[PDB]
Design an enzyme around this catalytic site. Structure first.
Site, PDB file in Angstrom:
ATOM      1  N   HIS A  48       3.749  11.155 -12.939  1.00  0.00           N
ATOM      2  CA  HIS A  48       3.830  11.716 -12.068  1.00  0.00           C
ATOM      3  C   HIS A  48       2.897  11.366 -10.653  1.00  0.00           C
ATOM      4  O   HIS A  48       1.711  11.233 -11.346  1.00  0.00           O
ATOM      5  CB  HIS A  48       3.537  13.329 -12.580  1.00  0.00           C
ATOM      6  N   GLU A  50       0.481  12.943  -9.481  1.00  0.00           N
ATOM      7  CA  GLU A  50      -0.118  13.775  -9.734  1.00  0.00           C
ATOM      8  C   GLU A  50      -1.401  12.490 -10.140  1.00  0.00           C
ATOM      9  O   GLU A  50      -2.638  12.666  -9.765  1.00  0.00           O
ATOM     10  CB  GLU A  50      -0.602  14.542  -9.709  1.00  0.00           C
ATOM     11  N   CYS A  79       2.820  20.204 -12.831  1.00  0.00           N
ATOM     12  CA  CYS A  79       3.362  20.602 -13.972  1.00  0.00           C
ATOM     13  C   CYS A  79       2.374  20.634 -15.055  1.00  0.00           C
ATOM     14  O   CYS A  79       1.415  20.349 -14.611  1.00  0.00           O
ATOM     15  CB  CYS A  79       4.095  19.292 -14.719  1.00  0.00           C
ATOM     16  N   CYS A  84       0.001  16.930 -16.404  1.00  0.00           N
ATOM     17  CA  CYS A  84      -0.594  16.688 -14.881  1.00  0.00           C
ATOM     18  C   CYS A  84      -1.735  17.737 -14.354  1.00  0.00           C
ATOM     19  O   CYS A  84      -2.499  17.539 -13.904  1.00  0.00           O
ATOM     20  CB  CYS A  84       0.557  17.018 -14.280  1.00  0.00           C
TER      21      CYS A  84
HETATM   22 ZN   LIG Z   1       3.534  16.327 -13.957  1.00  0.00          ZN
END
Ligand SMILES: [Zn+2]
Ligand SMILES: [Zn+2]
Lengths: 173, 174
Positions: A48, A50, A79, A84
């Protein structure tokens, strides 16, 4: 700094909450010393956006003796169930000279534990809020290959932001 | 209804927080109307935490929505945050405003890195959270356990562990 295609920005940062969207995220970032590094990131091959921002923190070569504010303009809120919020919390605990502000276009409620993500990031010191017109236009002006054209809002931008902001504030109250 | 084996109680409600344990939970509950009693116990089953299994059975108790009920949990671990228990309990209390929930925990669920957020969220939802003391352990022994007339026998450091955990909890919730 490489600039984003305008169509990519509009399709990813539209904040109409009643549209079914793909689970792709774009993350525009700026780092300010209290350096100025800026760019944007998307999810790639399971990682992801992030966590990809966390991956590049070493290459920013921040002075541990200096205080920095990191701002994320992110199309989805982070999330919980895929790590994350947890990795971001750990980074904040391990890098106390960094203060993170997360401005989200939309809330990622496809995660059953999305509220736990927002609540735990707040408890770890992140300032979490919903993007407003001001931030959308700032991002258009800053990260987008706009060729001098001004930001043109999509329908209902302000109503959507206020509705999502009220939901976020209720989650974090 | 049905009473718990004594060794099951003693191994699950021991309050030494530095023991490596299995992530099983036992939850003894009492439901009474305030100015109509239900009692039982539950454990985790096939991944579903005991707290959610208690919420699952609330309909079968046939509680009057017009009346106030006090629900007491004597629970071996405090409810988790990272797998959704605190959030689900908050939602239930918000949807069932006539429930007053008291959570008396033998241990704090330190296996969850976000256990403090769970405790704060339960308090914010109106739950009264506390740490089990000698009085509560003996009450549970006397009430939920197939003890065959035998008195409660404390384990080593029961009082010391309870006061230390109680001090931790009160600081988290101040
Ligand atoms: Zn995430
Ligand atoms: Zn749980």
């Amino acid at each position: 700094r490489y600039l984003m295609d305008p169509d990519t920005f509009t399709s990813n940062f539209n904040n109409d909450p009643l549209v079914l969207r793909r689970r792709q995220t774009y993350l525009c970032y700026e780092v300010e010393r209290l350096d100025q590094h800026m760019g944007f990131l998307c999810n790639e091959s399971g990682r992801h956006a992030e966590l990809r921002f966390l991956d590049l923190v070493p290459s920013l070569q921040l002075d541990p003796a200096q205080i920095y504010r990191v701002t994320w303009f992110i199309s989805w809120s982070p999330c919980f169930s895929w790590g994350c919020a947890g990795e971001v919390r750990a980074f904040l605990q391990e890098n106390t000279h960094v203060r993170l502000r997360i401005k989200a276009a939309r809330i990622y409620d496809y995660d059953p534990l999305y509220k736990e993500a927002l609540q735990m990031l707040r408890d770890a010191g992140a300032q979490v809020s919903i993007m407003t017109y001001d931030e959308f236009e700032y991002c258009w002006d800053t990260f987008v290959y706009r060729q001098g054209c001004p930001f043109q809002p999509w329908d209902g931008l302000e109503e959507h932001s206020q509705a999502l902001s009220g939901r976020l504030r209720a989650i974090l109250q």
